Design an enzyme around this catalytic site. Structure first.
Site, PDB file in Angstrom:
ATOM      1  N   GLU A  11       0.763  -1.202   0.000  1.00 54.55           N
ATOM      2  CA  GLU A  11       0.000   0.000   0.000  1.00 54.55           C
ATOM      3  C   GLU A  11       0.813   1.280   0.000  1.00 54.55           C
ATOM      4  OE1 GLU A  11      -3.209   0.103  -0.388  1.00 54.55           O
ATOM      5  OE2 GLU A  11      -3.880  -1.939   0.148  1.00 54.55           O
ATOM      6  N   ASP A  20      -6.561   6.513  -4.786  1.00 50.53           N
ATOM      7  CA  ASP A  20      -6.085   5.144  -4.957  1.00 50.53           C
ATOM      8  C   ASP A  20      -6.104   4.692  -6.438  1.00 50.53           C
ATOM      9  OD1 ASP A  20      -8.623   4.286  -5.272  1.00 50.53           O
ATOM     10  OD2 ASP A  20      -8.735   3.031  -3.474  1.00 50.53           O
ATOM     11  N   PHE A 104      -8.371  -6.611   3.352  1.00 48.54           N
ATOM     12  CA  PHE A 104      -7.976  -5.208   3.522  1.00 48.54           C
ATOM     13  C   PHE A 104      -8.159  -4.393   2.236  1.00 48.54           C
ATOM     14  CE2 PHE A 104      -5.360  -2.249   6.005  1.00 48.54           C
ATOM     15  CZ  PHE A 104      -4.965  -1.341   5.022  1.00 48.54           C
TER      16      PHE A 104
END
Ligand code: CL
Ligand code: CL
Length: 162
Positions: A11, A20, A104
């Site tokens: 990430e 993102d 996640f």
């Protein structure tokens, strides 16, 4: 290597609001803020998450604190999910990290939708599950990250991350 170092690699860390891969407002270590196109809606959520007026910027400590909550929430969603739980229980510690990683990134519901791959992982048919996991939008949109996760499921080692 552990789940935390694995996710930090996948990430990255950003202290200012960013978008993102899907174009959504995010901050820190992959903490999705909102799916809304409004940077204001994003700033608002941020301040709510941190407990202060942030003007879109946070410290490393704040970032790590959101990260710890998010990993905890991820595990707990898995354990509360009737589809995920049995799979997770069946796996070794390294492979459990790979499942947490997927949750996640794509949420519990999303993972739960990989019915066939979950069945294959439960049966420990590693190579077949890897091929099935790859036939997905997920793999097609974030191929390098998917390969890493997938390799972890296939091998049960941290080699993709070393
Ligand atoms: Cl939150
Ligand atoms: Cl990628």
């Amino acid at each position: 290597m552990n789940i935390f170092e694995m996710l930090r690699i996948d990430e990255g860390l950003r202290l200012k609001i960013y978008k993102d891969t899907e174009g959504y407002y995010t901050i820190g270590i992959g903490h999705l803020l909102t799916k809304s196109p409004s940077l204001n809606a994003a700033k608002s959520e941020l301040d709510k998450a941190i407990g202060r007026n942030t003007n879109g910027v946070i410290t490393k400590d704040e970032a790590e604190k959101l990260f710890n909550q998010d990993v905890d929430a991820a595990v707990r969603g898995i354990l509360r999910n009737a589809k995920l739980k049995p799979v997770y229980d069946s796996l070794d510690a390294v492979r459990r990290a790979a499942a947490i990683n997927m949750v996640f990134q794509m949420g519990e519901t999303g993972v739960a939708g990989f019915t066939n791959s979950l069945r294959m992982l439960q049966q420990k048919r590693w190579d077949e599950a890897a091929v099935n996991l790859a036939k997905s939008r997920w793999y097609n949109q974030t191929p390098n990250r998917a390969k890493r996760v997938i390799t972890t499921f296939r091998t049960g080692t941290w080699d993709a991350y070393k």
